[PDB]
Amino acid sequence: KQGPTSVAYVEVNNNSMLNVGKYTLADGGGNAFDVAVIFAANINYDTGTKTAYLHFNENVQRVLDNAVTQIRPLQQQGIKVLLSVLGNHQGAGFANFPSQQAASAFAKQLSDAVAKYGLDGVDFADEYAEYGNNGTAQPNDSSFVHLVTALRANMPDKIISLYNIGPAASRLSYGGVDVSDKFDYAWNPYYGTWQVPGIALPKAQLSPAAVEIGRTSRSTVADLARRTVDEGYGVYLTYNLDGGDRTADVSAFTRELYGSEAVRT
Ligand SMILES: [Zn+2]
């Protein structure tokens, strides 16, 4: 298989991670998706200790606890699995950690979770943090740099990606350290559109295209995949892969990215 890196986000609240492994290319048998993203664990805030911390809702916890059936099989077949981390309406977000030490403690929780569950990486989605709730501060310009630097240091050989949205995504440089190069990938969060991420990464690691499989018209899915290849971009994002038969939708972009339509087990 040769072509852009395919990524699929799965809202584990309602869907199975395994669905991502169901699609392969008719010509070649390669995976239609190269990366699967568990959406989403989150950044919580303890008002008492005034400390942010990593939280997994029951659904996220359930899939992590069942890594052998929910995650391991995807990895066995060559698909990378990442844990997305999202804001949780509690004031704490990736852009408002008060210090280097504070950001670093949270990065350890992340890297520890990655090792414990045998994950391939982390995805940062700075949305719904609601900076300010519970007496918290507004995003500052060192928090994210500190968090990314620590995480990357913690897991040098794993994946770290950026869902391109929010205060954090605009605060990649501080004190002479630009954290753009510590990210493996970055992508557009707006389904049905082409929006090149601002983060200073080369085309090969960016996905200006974004589609919500089953919702975006197969014409637009095909168009964005076509533009991806034509403009030389190296990633393509599919959001909300569900349990329905989306072979036609997956084929809409695989024909363009890989030259083969897809098959679903
Ligand atoms: Zn809210």
Q: How far, in Å, is the centroid of ligand 1 from the Cα of 89? A: 4
Distance 27 CA to ligand 1 centre (A): 46
- Give the method used: X-ray
Tokens linked to 147: 């968090």
Q: How far is CA 166 from CA 4, 55, 94, 130, 222, in A?
A: 25, 20, 9, 10, 28
Nearest-angstrom CA–CA distance, 195 and 191: 10
Contact partners, residue 156, CB within 8 Å, separation at least 6: none
Tell me the two tokens of residue 256. 């363009």
Residues designated catalytic? 127
* Helix H or strand E segment including 164: none
Dihedral in degrees, nearest 10, Cα atoms 225, 194, 14, 94: 130
Alpha carbons 143 and 95: distance in angstroms, whole number = 5
CA dihedral 163, 164, 168, 171 (to 10 degrees): 140
CB 153 within 8 A of CB 110: no
Distance in Å, CA 128 to ligand 1 centroid:
6
Helix (H) or strand (E) holding 128: none
- Listed by start position, the domains of the chain span 1-265
Does CATH number 3.20.20.80 belong to domain 1-265? yes
Dist. CA 88 → ligand 1 center (Å): 7
Q: Terminus-to-terminus CA distance in the chain, angstroms?
A: 19
Parallel, antiparallel, or unpaired for β 177-178 and 193-194?
unpaired
Q: Residue by residue, what is the 3-state secondary structure of 16-64?
A: CHHHHHHEEECCCCCECCCEEEEEEEEEEEECCCCEEEEECCHHHHHHH
Q: Are strands 80-87 and 35-46 parallel, antiparallel or unpaired?
A: parallel
Rg (CA), the chain: 18
Å from CA of 200 to ligand 1 middle:
30
**CA angle 192–195–201, rounded 5-degree value:** 135
In angstroms, how far is CA 203 from the centroid of its own chain? 17
| Residue 214 φ/ψ region, left for φ over 0, alpha for ψ in the -120 to 50 degree band, beta for the rest | left
